Design brief:
The complex is a heterodimer of chains A (about 30) and B (about 240).
Chain A (H helix, E strand, L loop, with lengths): L3 H23 L3
Chain B lengths: L2 H14 L3 H8 L22 H14 L18 H14 L5 H12 L5 E12 L2 E12 L2 E5 L10 E5 L2 H14 L3 E7 L18 E4 H4 L1 H15 L2
Helix pairs in contact in B: 1-2, 3-5, 4-5
PDB class: peptide binding protein/hydrolase
Keywords: protease, complex, peptide binding protein, Structural Genomics, Structural Genomics Consortium, SGC, PEPTIDE BINDING PROTEIN-HYDROLASE complex
Assembly: dimeric
């Protein structure tokens, strides 16, 4: 319901940032 | 993850990266981040030969990318029963986040449980370099009598080997040669038993059925030990 769409939109936001971070950390070698 | 964990990761990034804070500044809250497509779990026709299936499993594992963030997103208790680890493998598939060496082994098992003619078993390495010890693990596989490996590594030659090696020794010494090319000495090899194909199995992975000391054994005693272990995996 509307509670569950907030947890899918919070995990999508985190994933995007996690991969942006992974890119930055990968190019620190 | 929750907010505590989430803010742990960013403070840990703040320490390890040179300009730790500006990196969080630029990424957290950003409206124009690249949307990452969720990787499709590989499914196989019964006509597809198992080696082609393994290439697809390895591509999917790579697709998730190696986890460089310094915070591991999927804790792996090596003593959990298989049905617990397979629940966790299912969640890696649904969350679709970066992974490291141990997580790819669990994923490799989950994705190959549909291949009963394929034997799976963990292989872990302890290597030494410049005063430090290093631990790595891959998923050894046997198909139609030949050996290969699935895994995730920071180096291309320390993960995927197609099942072409005629003996287990050749597979492991290939890994030793790859370690030597980047100046790591192979100290110890730990080989587990075959993993059941039942994703609901209540049994543990036996991670340490054989432990071989490659220097205290010597070359030929190291190879005969790997061959007894291969024989012991044909129960």
């Amino acid at each position: 319901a509307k509670q569950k769409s907030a947890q899918q939109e919070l995990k999508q936001r985190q994933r995007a940032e996690i991969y942006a971070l992974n890119r930055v950390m990968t190019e620190l070698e | 993850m929750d907010e505590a964990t989430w803010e742990r990761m960013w403070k840990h990034v703040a320490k390890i990266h040179p300009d730790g804070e500006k990196v969080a500044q630029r990424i957290r809250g950003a409206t124009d981040l690249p949307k990452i497509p969720i990787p499709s779990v590989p499914t196989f026709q019964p006509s597809t030969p198992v080696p082609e299936r393994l290439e697809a499993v390895q591509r999917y594992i790579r697709e998730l990318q190696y986890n460089h963030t310094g915070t591991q997103f999927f804790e792996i208790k090596k003593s959990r029963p298989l049905t617990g680890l397979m629940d966790l493998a299912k969640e890696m598939t649904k969350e679709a986040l970066p992974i490291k060496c141990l997580e790819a082994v669990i994923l490799g098992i989950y994705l190959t449980n549909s291949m009963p003619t394929l034997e799976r078993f963990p292989i872990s390495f302890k290597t030494y370099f410049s005063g430090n010890y290093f631990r790595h693990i891959v998923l050894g596989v046997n198909f139609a009598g030949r050996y290969g490996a699935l895994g995730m590594s920071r180096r291309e030659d320390l993960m995927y080997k197609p099942p072409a090696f005629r003996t287990l020794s050749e597979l492991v010494l290939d890994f030793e040669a790859a370690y030597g090319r980047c100046w790591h000495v192979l100290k110890k090899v730990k080989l587990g038993q075959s993993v059941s194909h039942d994703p609901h199995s209540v049994e543990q992975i036996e991670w340490k059925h054989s432990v071989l000391d490659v220097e205290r054994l010597g070359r030929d005693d190291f190879r005969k030990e790997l061959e007894r272990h291969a024989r012991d995996m044909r129960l």
